[PDB]
Symmetry: C2
């Protein structure tokens, strides 16, 4: 029920992430330009969420009659709005991919027999609204499919589970419901969740800031720990499964995700508890054969040394601040949870491209 | 070297840890009471250093002729100030043990035929001076023997090594030179240190605050990382060994240390690099046979949720904040480095009785 995106016809609202977690508050999004500025100010987080907010902000404009008149004028209007949206945060592909589809829909709904302005307007809007529902439904599917598979692996005879997660993959990283946190929501709904542990996820602290917030909001029994306590928690706090999200899963299942994920997979193996990656198919990059081919983005060292504008670390120390690490697929012992199902790493490539 | 404690006869200064790592201010100490305040104010950190700072403040006063009159009074004076010092931060026993023998030293030489006021004074002052030197030499030995063992294990053909460490075990945790950081200092002096990685060590950040400070200070080539980056560093940044300190090593070698240590050991094993625990013999507790007997401290949740007086974590979230975890001895693949040198866990009980 936590919504980072609120949408109805003619009406788009977004939860302002900058104010979290002290305050939860929405901002009305009236125009494509407003969306662009919100995305850039980091009010909207998560590539799927960024894409939807931009596309829905176009749908809000169109519903108000913006664009046109004519068809070429309207299609041109749509294309310039979409292309402008792609410039907001090009750090990820979701917006660009959604922009093509909508541009194609509007062109594939600008070149028919007896084509007309109102038809283009309504159909572009409807696809955008279909995008939203599909993404929400797929997230729920990840949650339910992943929850079932995890339960069958860890407590098939009934009996609850204690899940540990990393970074933020919830409503605050997605259109809604989430991926790995979606699995936790689904387990809670089934009444099969004993407890959820979440790590701080240094240095950007999204587990402490956002995942903690989501868990408290949903009143899911939960505990925050430091990244350094993961091993202790598995040994002493009865952790029975690990579920994380993914920034990128490559063709063999190697998973780039927020740094510390690789470490989590190692410690889970040591304690013989299954490790799951939850990722929609559109987070799976079948071009790359292995994790070797991934460039690990490194971010500025001040983002590690400083918190809230105050330097914590000693002056002059060198810093290594990779944003992500890569988990080799042989440590993904639970499986890869997609909207299409749960797959062993070696199965992923063929499964995603030959099943619906 | 970096000195948290600067002492010469009649003069004691301590590095004010509260102001680290921005500033280095040395605070002169002319009294046992002054010491007591500094220990309670947490200007002094590390059990050995706390014990030495106390005993040495007594020594500055004994050098000051504080103590009178006779001999029986001086012994009485000494016994009192040591009892006083114990009340500062009893959380660490190093002071208690220090007091009990410094008292017993003051006793035997008081019982000595023809015992005199001056002789028993100098002898007490000299004793505390000897404790300082011994502790420094023992740390140097941990570092030197540890470093040598590590080089033979990891780089027998020569070649430099990259060491990863956790929390703070250096001059800012000890009398000087340090234990795990001592090994890094020794590797560096030998020109065999490629690089040192130190973890932030959440939630008290001793790695980011203090260990990074010491490494920069001694111009040791070093990089700070978060605790969650340890695995990535091992796989991609050529870490060739781990060396950590210890709060308590028990008879079978099971080691209680700053939470995350157990995690480092697991991650080291995964990457097939040796894991060392550096521990002076007085950090070894033979009264307990295994880590199952260790009762883990949980500190308040606020000290995890908040940084710098400002809450980071989402309001209302439950918190688990154990101070320590326990590393099983069979993950101590490097060895346990005492001032006597490096032992496999199985050898430790025999070696220390």
């Amino acid at each position: 029920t936590l919504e980072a995106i609120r949408y109805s016809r003619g009406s788009l609202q977004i939860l302002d992430q900058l104010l979290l977690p002290k305050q939860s508050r929405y901002e009305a999004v009236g125009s494509v330009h407003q969306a662009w500025e919100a995305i850039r100010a980091m009010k909207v987080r998560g590539a799927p969420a960024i894409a939807l907010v931009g596309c829905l902000s176009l749908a809000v404009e169109l519903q108000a009659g913006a664009g046109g008149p004519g068809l070429a004028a309207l299609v041109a209007f749509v294309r310039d709005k979409l292309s402008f949206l792609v410039t907001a945060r090009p750090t990820a592909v979701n917006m660009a991919r959604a922009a093509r589809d909508l541009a194609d829909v509007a062109a594939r709904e600008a070149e028919r027999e007896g084509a007309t302005e109102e038809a283009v307007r309504e159909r572009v809007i409807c696809c955008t609204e279909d995008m939203l529902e599909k993404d929400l439904r797929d997230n729920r599917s990840i949650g339910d499919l992943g929850a079932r598979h995890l339960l069958e692996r860890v407590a098939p005879s009934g009996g609850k589970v204690t899940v540990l997660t990393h970074c933020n993959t919830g409503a605050l990283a997605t259109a809604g419901y989430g991926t790995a946190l979606g699995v936790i929501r689904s387990l809670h709904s089934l009444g099969r969740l004993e407890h959820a542990f979440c790590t701080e996820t240094r240095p950007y602290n999204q587990g402490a800031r956002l995942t903690a917030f989501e868990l408290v909001y949903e009143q899911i029994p939960a505990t925050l720990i430091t990244d350094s306590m993961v091993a202790a928690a598995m040994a002493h706090r009865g952790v029975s499964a690990v579920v994380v999200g993914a920034d990128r899963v490559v063709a063999n299942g190697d998973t780039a995700n927020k740094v510390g994920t690789y470490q989590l997979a190692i410690v889970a193996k040591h304690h013989g508890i299954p490790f799951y990656v939850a990722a929609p198919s559109y987070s799976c990059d079948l071009r790359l054969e292995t994790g070797k081919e991934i460039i690990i983005e490194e971010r500025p060292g001040q983002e590690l040394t400083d918190v809230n504008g105050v330097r914590i670390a000693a002056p002059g120390i060198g810093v290594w601040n990779p944003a992500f690490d890569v988990t080799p697929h042989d440590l993904i012992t639970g499986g890869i949870i997609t909207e299409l199902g749960v797959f062993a790493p070696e199965e992923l490539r063929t499964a995603l491209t030959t099943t619906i």
